[PDB]
Assembly symmetry: C2
Homo-oligomer: 59 residues x 2
């Protein structure tokens, strides 16, 4: 219900979410780019992961 506006262009890499078992050991890739959210574009109708710092609150 909160809506956001994209502040910059972002082109997808095609990475998907990762299946993993309890006990696996993992490392974060590109930590310096910050965290991500699953999002839905009202503009295009597409859905996928986006970087948090590319968007700001919007009407």
């Amino acid at each position: 219900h909160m809506t956001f506006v994209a502040l910059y262009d972002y082109v997808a890499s095609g990475e998907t979410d990762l299946s993993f078992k309890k006990g696996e050991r993992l490392q974060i890739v590109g930590y310096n780019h910050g965290d991500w959210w699953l999002a839905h574009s009202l503009t295009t109708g597409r859905t996928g992961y986006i970087p948090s710092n590319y968007v700001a609150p919007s009407d």
Copy 2:
């Protein structure tokens, strides 16, 4: 270089990252599940997005 251990199993949905243009309007899907990171499993060698609260710091 920080390593994490998975505390729970997670099965991928197959969602990818999302391409978007500056100015698009977006909404977050499943905000209550928290944020995500791109990660690489040392255990399986696979890479993909994971939910932050499924992992803890590890040796």
